[PDB]
Symmetry: D3
Subunit: 164 residues, 6 copies
């Protein structure tokens, strides 16, 4: 059938623990990436109701730092779907505990592929964008889903050229 983007929306707001802070009192980029993928993998399975796997991560720019005085929240939902794969948009917002001042520290698209119990890609519902914002994000996702093939190709190129 077909599912609304909001059917797969996932929210997660966390505290900023010292473990994840580097020397400059800002999160390690990895912490954010690990979390983006995590919250997105949940969106992937909510939409597909299948056991998903992460195929790719779109480039990510860390627009602002997220410090200990901050608070991070992630939001994610599926916006674009292929036959077997789906693109999950992820939004990361930091919030000052005393000010309330929020600001988006990073965003990205994570691609997931639904698999059968025997590693066979499996059809996935279609997404249907409601909000005006969701429609814009879907347009962007459409364009990002086109370069996907070039990227993969470049990735396979670097691989073969490499030593283990």
């Amino acid at each position: 059938k077909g599912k609304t983007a909001n059917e797969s929306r996932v929210f997660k707001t966390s505290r900023v623990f010292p473990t994840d802070l580097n020397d400059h009192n800002t999160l390690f980029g990895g912490k954010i990436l690990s979390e983006m993928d995590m919250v997105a993998s949940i969106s992937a399975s909510r939409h597909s109701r299948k056991e998903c796997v992460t195929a790719s991560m779109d480039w990510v720019d860390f627009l602002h730092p997220v410090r200990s005085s901050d608070c991070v929240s992630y939001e994610s939902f599926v916006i674009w779907t292929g036959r077997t794969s789906m693109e999950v948009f992820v939004k990361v917002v930091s919030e000052y505990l005393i000010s309330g001042e929020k600001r988006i520290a990073a965003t990205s698209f994570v691609t997931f592929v639904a698999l059968s119990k025997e590693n066979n890609p499996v059809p996935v519902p279609r997404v249907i964008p409601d909000t005006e914002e969701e429609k814009e994000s879907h347009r962007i996702a459409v364009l990002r889903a086109e370069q996907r093939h070039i990227r993969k190709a470049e990735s396979k190129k670097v691989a073969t050229l490499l030593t283990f």
Copy 2:
């Protein structure tokens, strides 16, 4: 002044813990993304001898699943430098315990920027690619750095349209 690429090479092999396996008995991409950033940040500070901050992560294609029957290894090192930014390359290899066979699970570049105590971009030594493979990876790190301005324009755009 000048610093060999290998003078910042960083290794790391770990087992695959159940904690990080999805419902398909494979690693969450997030786990790998975090390790790539982690290991890469060490390379960055080893080279700059200033503690660094991750500025952005390049696109990442998860070429092969990493299972509990494997163990992952991460290799990373600087292969490009600007004034205060460094392009760090990272490769991920999966190794089958009993068979002994390896596979590049993924690769990428993570851009780090060196900062002062007062959080200001500070100069960083130039990197000197020795090996043929290093030269080729540097040849590529260059193309990536050349597109960093448009990649950022793409991100700043999405952030702009987002409402939170």
Copy 3:
């Protein structure tokens, strides 16, 4: 200077990891308890915009199991205030991965107290219930608070007769 209950509302959806499961593939009650306080503390500072300390945890009944086949969601918000304290409501929703089925696995009230950098209870804004659900939860909260002095006197006595 009166905040709407929704201004302190906090969400979090997580997967159910093996580490938090006993031999019945059900979460340890403790895991849920920990996440309730966490999520409720973020609500407390969202609303008080001060760092908060948890004063007491209302009694908690684990109505249903939370298996590896589910994902857990936590929702919380300030629903009652005194002078320097807040009663934060928290609801735990268990959702079935492949079937989309949901149930409340538990609910509770966590009481937080705002403190100054000198460990002194500081005044906190008043909370305003909007929806019917919020108005109802508020009454339940009013009742809970009407008896906290008793609960505490009971706790103090037990500590009294204890040899450590």
Copy 4:
């Protein structure tokens, strides 16, 4: 077939790590709650010699702060039994590192239910209070149990009026 309360007694002393401290260098209540259930579940299986599921957590008052300057100790034991359930008592003692000073930081009753591999409540041995402390805690437990059906009916109703 009647076990002494002491046969299920469990101890644990831990340091206070930065990760579990809020901005007041006091433990998150949740951390303590988690450790109480953990330690109490080990007592439950020590006594029932079956894998146990946590049914409910009695109300909990955090009488004192637990700072990084302390170490926490947890003690627990079965102090009441029904047919298939047990009420496990738990006391949290905070001890000052350089001064040796101790205080009860919290106490509580955690209720566990023994289950068969088919998720069925199984009979558990009867517990025998020995010391005066144990006999007293037992009476308090008897009272707690006399009202659990009410507490649960109250929890079920809240879940009822909740929209998720």
Copy 5:
């Protein structure tokens, strides 16, 4: 002055989590070692009431495996003291959750040195063994404290001979 060995006794019983189990369903030796040192460092500070550091680990033999069906408990206390250092005995016992069958999986002595806020070794109370068992363990500790110097010496020898 002088303190009884029991003044520093520390108990800790834990569950065996999957994360720490290797491929053969037995704990990684590291998990046990990390824990022995941990519980022992607590004994060290309880006795010395000083901030301690771990100087050495005596060899450790893993007599039996500790599986998921097991339960581990550590016990530690100071038995031998120098002027500035102290030897902490550590006992590790696994217990079958269904049988109750206990057995000691490993034991060892960990040496700690009390330090002043400026890294200067600092005098430590004297230990006084009460139990007959404690007296035997103290005799053994006395002999182990003699070879300490040879060991250290061999350690320094291997170090200098090594490449970084």
Copy 6:
């Protein structure tokens, strides 16, 4: 048949997280002990291609503190073999971030034994020391293996006298 030592060499560099720092801003010995075992177990299975179990750990002298201002690196590899047991050598190097200077923080040997699915010691390839340094470390691993029988008699004794 035959396998080079380096064919099992394993590297690993990590940052020093606050979680593992004692009250003296230095690593808990336990943290290091765990990493030495971890890294060494990988070396063991890389060599034997059978998953291994840690049999014993050699004495360990903590020659230098490892601070938050450093980052630790672990190198390990097999340098001695018996029929089914392997002597794995492990070195720990601390590296000062800003200065760039290194120090051997500790070193040791960890004995691993290869097991079948049915938990039976299974034969393991011989190890071939190449480098001069390897030969010297093997020359030593031999002396250690020669005393393993008395080291075990010492441990079995302590276990015998212990009452639990």
